[PDB]
Amino acid sequence: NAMPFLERPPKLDGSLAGDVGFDPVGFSNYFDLRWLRESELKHGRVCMLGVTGLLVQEAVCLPQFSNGKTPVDDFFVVPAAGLWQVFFAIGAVEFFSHGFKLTPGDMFSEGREAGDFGFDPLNLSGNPDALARRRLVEVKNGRLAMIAFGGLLHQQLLTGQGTFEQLANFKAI
């Protein structure tokens, strides 16, 4: 296990992917595991997209936009009206995907498993074994994306330099 000196969490069973028994506090003991897994998948997917955005906006800038010194500054140079529609379009996407069941009690009522919405433009989710492998890869890369996005954002905020450009010259503080 992840904590050999501790015991396995009671609510934690190996049904979900990425289960290593890592829950030293009892978040799963006090909150629904389906809700926690949905939040984990949402954070991980948002962080994958954020990592790609941080690595791309330093290299590619839209012609109808101003290119800031860093992607964090790319956020600032965008007009606030664009940021607000981004916010409200994401909110509309949340409303459509959750079926107007934002509250934790209303969510997971009509099955939906945990963190599943229905998204397969290309059918790569047929066989259950490959589906489970894809789930494990997805959750691991999502957690790695959370850590990596935190690191990239904070290093960009501190040094004021892009990630690849920071790799060009370290400039230790």
Partner: protein, 183 residues
């Protein structure tokens, strides 16, 4: 009577169950509090003291190329304002949250006090379990020794303004005392 102290009795709940039990508990600490919680505290103190003693020796002997060469107390003072001490505190606290979780597991029986199953190398894990208790004894002894040694170090550094290797090389008395003349 107690083994360590001939004129005292064996301190009740103090037997060979825990390593290094010479019956030394003149004040009833093992009766006011659980003996396993006290053993966890002793192991934490001793391990931190061993690391601190080794760090004192090496820092007096050697310094990294990206750190200012200063006495260890001056190193603490300099890196408090530099942020390195903040980093050490943050990561140590992050580990010690899970350490406290393990301690709470220890309180309700279960895991052995001070045992984290930490063994990157094959030492007393498999094929060497028969030495494990021996190792345990050695560990606590070193712990206790370190808990004294580091202490002496710093207080000697407080009285002579010298490193421990400097005091070993040049064992001059307490400053101002060779002149004496107190009357």
């Amino acid at each position: 009577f107690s083994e360590s102290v001939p004129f005292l009795k064996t301190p009740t709940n103090l037997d060979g169950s825990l390593p290094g039990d010479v019956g030394f508990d003149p004040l009833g600490f093992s009766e006011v509090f659980d003996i396993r919680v006290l053993r966890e505290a002793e192991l934490k103190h001793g391990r931190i003291a061993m690391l601190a003693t080794l760090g004192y020796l090496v820092q007096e002997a050697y310094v990294l190329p990206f750190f200012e060469k200063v006495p260890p107390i001056q190193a603490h003072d300099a890196l408090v304002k530099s942020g390195g001490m903040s980093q050490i505190l943050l990561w140590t606290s992050f580990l010690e949250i899970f350490g406290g979780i393990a301690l709470f597991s220890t309180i309700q029986g279960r895991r052995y006090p001070g045992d984290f199953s930490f063994d990157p190398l094959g030492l007393s894990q498999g094929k060497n379990a028969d030495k494990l208790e021996q190792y345990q004894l050695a560990e606590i002894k070193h712990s206790r020794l370190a808990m004294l040694a580091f202490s002496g170090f710093v207080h000697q550094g407080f009285i002579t303004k010298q490193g421990v290797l400097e005091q070993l090389g040049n064992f001059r008395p307490i400053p101002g005392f060779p002149e004496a003349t107190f009357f």
